[PDB]
Structures are given as structure tokens and as C-alpha cells.
């Protein structure tokens, strides 16, 4: 009968097209340790994810950019 995964695509597009209708807000979640733990960071493990999550570049957009939005014509 029609598969799990293709029906999952018949839901994936319901997950992820709505997401391109919706303005994003982001939570850029790093893992400090691969050991489950409270408090444990690793100096190379974070540094890796600072490159894998794209931080240098992710800076050079929103470093210039705006947290708050709120409608200006109302603001005038």
C-alpha cells in the first residue's frame, strides 16, 4: 500500500512549505559535550560546531542586522 516515507513527504511539505510562508526566528543549538552531561564543554567540540553551524558568516549577515521588528507606519 502507499509507503510510510512517501506519506511522510505528503506531510514533509506540510512541515516545510509553511515554514517558507512563516518568517523565521532561530535557535542555534550547539552541543558542548558528546557525553550527555551537565556543564561539560569541549574547546574543540564547540569550535567545530561554530564552523558547522556557520557562525563566522552567520555573523556577517545579522551582525549588521535587526532583532526587533515592529511596524513603522504605526511607529510614525
Amino acid at each position: 500500500f502507499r509507503t510510510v516515507g512517501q506519506l511522510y513527504k505528503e506531510q514533509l511539505t506540510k512541515l516545510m512549505t509553511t515554514l517558507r510562508n512563516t518568517n523565521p526566528n532561530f535557535v542555534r543549538c550547539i552541543i558542548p559535550n558528546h557525553e550527555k552531561r551537565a556543564g561539560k564543554l569541549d574547546a574543540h567540540l564547540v569550535l567545530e560546531q561554530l564552523r558547522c553551524n556557520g557562525v563566522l558568516e552567520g555573523i556577517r549577515i545579522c551582525r549588521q542586522g535587526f532583532p526587533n521588528r515592529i511596524v513603522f507606519q504605526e511607529f510614525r
Binding site: 505528503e10 506540510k14 512549505t17 509553511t18
Partner: protein, 49 residues
């Protein structure tokens, strides 16, 4: 009074559904076309095959 004030608001709720229905219309017309292009391909590939 009480019917009036309410009819007003429920219509905005039917507006919430209204957009989403066109969003699904948009999607189902995508899916259809996905399927037509795949069928159009398989028909023409049947010929060549």
C-alpha cells in the same frame, strides 16, 4: 445584539481556514503536476522502451 457581534468574529476564523485551503490548493496542484510530469515521462519512456 449577541448573535451579531459573534457572526463578525467567526468569519475571521473562517478567514484563517480560507488561506490554508488555498495553501492546500497550491500544494495539491503542485503534487498533481509532480505526478503528471512523472506520468508524462513514463508515457514517453514507454514509447522509447
Amino acid at each position: 445584539e449577541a448573535r451579531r457581534k459573534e457572526l463578525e468574529e467567526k468569519m475571521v476564523s473562517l478567514l484563517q481556514e480560507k488561506n490554508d485551503l488555498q495553501l492546500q490548493v497550491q500544494a495539491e496542484q503542485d503534487n498533481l503536476a509532480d505526478a503528471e510530469e512523472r506520468c508524462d515521462q513514463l508515457i514517453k519512456n514507454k514509447i522509447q522502451l
